[PDB]
């Protein structure tokens, strides 16, 4: 017997003490070594209720990543309201590593194993674990990168899909590589992201068909964000310590959902020195980019969407979203919850 409960988890990782890479440095001090032989066991006949949207595991991870970024990517100049914070801002080694979250004695983590579990409600095939899988604390908007994949069908996650105010997390079952590059020796800030238009469009078609299941076979339309901060109108992410802003207009291109658009999609990108902080703490200023080839190849494993709505309309329009980085952690922690003995 047990009950739902919240407790201070501890983290584990395979961080290396010799590394100057900032995730390794944080994890070396914050986390314990992983268990080379962890204990997972199926629970014979147990049905437990999960709620990914009300999971305190998400809050703790958010706090850790904020802590990590505070120590690792401190800006040259931080502007928060009416103050100006100057700090050393040397170029550093930046490449996220997987972080496991673990329960202390007296608690355990229940893991949902239903193949098409959407994140809320009952789970019938349940197991208990010591720790979560390795989760890379990748901070991004619009596109979820380097995450896990859904095992069976594409999964549409939402607190309430009929409520258009609630964010949508699309969990892909096949990843699409996005190859971002700031080339070396005009504009040192000019970059670009390359995607296999054939792989992407086919996945986007699958996402469309999956959305039709939930929305009465209505026409599914994709549109770019109509406006707002650059960090959410663009695909915002950090590559090798540099802050990228990529235009995803071409990714959400309904024409390819048969014109000959099976080629390479090249998204225009920009590295910015001045950014709005996802932590909510004003704006940050960094030094101009390092010299040479800046390159990050990532797996697109999920998508953040908002639905326009409309009282009756024949279409449903979706736009890339994100900005609340807690949802990034939710897309990985959705199948876990803490209980007390």
């Amino acid at each position, epitope marked *: 017997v047990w009950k739902d409960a919240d407790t201070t988890l501890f983290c584990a990782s395979d961080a290396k003490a010799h590394e100057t890479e900032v995730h390794n440095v944080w994890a070396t001090h914050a986390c314990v070594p992983t268990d080379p032989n962890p204990q997972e066991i199926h629970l014979e006949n147990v049905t437990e209720n999960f709620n990914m949207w009300k999971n305190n595991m998400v809050e703790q991870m958010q706090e850790d990543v904020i802590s990590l970024w505070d120590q690792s990517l401190q800006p040259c100049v931080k502007l928060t309201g009416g103050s100006v914070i100057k700090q050393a801002c040397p170029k550093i080694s930046f490449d996220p590593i997987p972080i496991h979250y673990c329960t202390p004695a007296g608690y355990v983590i229940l893991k949902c194993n239903d193949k098409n579990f959407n994140g809320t409600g009952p789970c019938k095939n349940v197991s208990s674990v010591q720790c979560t899988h390795g989760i890379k604390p990748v901070v991004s908007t619009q596109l979820l990168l380097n995450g896990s994949l859904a095992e069976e069908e594409i999964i549409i996650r939402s607190e309430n899909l009929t409520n258009n105010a609630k964010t949508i997390i699309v969990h892909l079952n096949k990843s699409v590589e996005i190859n971002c590059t700031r080339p070396s020796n005009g504009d040192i800030r000019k970059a670009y992201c390359e995607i296999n238009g054939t792989k992407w469009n086919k996945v986007l078609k699958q996402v469309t068909e999956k959305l039709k299941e939930h929305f009465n076979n209505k026409t599914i339309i994709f549109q770019p*964000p*109509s406006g707002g901060d650059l960090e959410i109108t663009m695909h915002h992410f950090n590559c090798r310590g540099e802050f990228f802003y990529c235009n995803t207009t071409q990714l959400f291109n309904n024409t390819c959902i048969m014109k000959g658009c099976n080629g390479t999609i090249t998204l225009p990108c920009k590295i910015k020195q001045i950014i709005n902080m996802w932590q909510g703490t*004003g704006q940050a200023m960094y030094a101009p980019p390092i010299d040479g080839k800046i390159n990050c190849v990532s797996n697109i494993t999920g998508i953040l969407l908002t639905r326009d709505g409309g009282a009756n309309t024949s279409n449903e329009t979706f736009r890339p979203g994100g900005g609340n980085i807690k949802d990034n952690w939710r897309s990985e922690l959705y199948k876990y919850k803490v209980v007390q003995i």
Partner: antibody
Amino acid sequence: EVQLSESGGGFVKPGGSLRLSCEASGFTFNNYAMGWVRQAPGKGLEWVSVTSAHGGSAYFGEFVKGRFTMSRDHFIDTVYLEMNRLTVEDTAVYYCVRVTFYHEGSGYYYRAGNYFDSWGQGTLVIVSA
Amino acid sequence: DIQMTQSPSSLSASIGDRVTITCRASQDIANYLNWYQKKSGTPPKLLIFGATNLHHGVSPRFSGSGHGTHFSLTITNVQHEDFANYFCQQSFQTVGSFGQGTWVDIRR
């Protein structure tokens, strides 16, 4: 219950500067974008400015043309609108507004698709020589 | 950039009437449209957001409709408190903008 209280209104010479403030209470200030709307005598409502929750970005109506500045102080839940190079046409009642988004999920970032759910009583700015 | 044009400029109504104010955007703004009421002496009051959603506390005698460029606000069973100036507002672009207003006065 949401409460917005403006101050800093009064008289100012054309070409002069004037800062409005809005003290907010009854909600979590750090979570919401905040803005300003004005109405000049005999005219309609006019979109002046909004600043994101994180306070690192602000956007302005077309008439502003680089003259105004916003800032927010999270220690005292106050939003500011600094107005410079004012003209007689800027004479108006200025309203502090709270901004709510149609959609959750943007966190502290400002996004299009929003509405002014709560309004202050407004404060009168008179630009005259 | 986006101009909001309301029609008519003004209209008269009796208690109990139903009136409709229309709002046209110079370009597509989906359902990103809000409606406000303004009476002298008091600040603007939100009525409708997202084209069709009635704001909490507002009488359901108010309803909004439209999607794209053409929108309307309908006031059913007009009451004395409804005699006011009404404004539409797009929030589609980063910078929003208001319509020029439509006022409703008492027919005689």
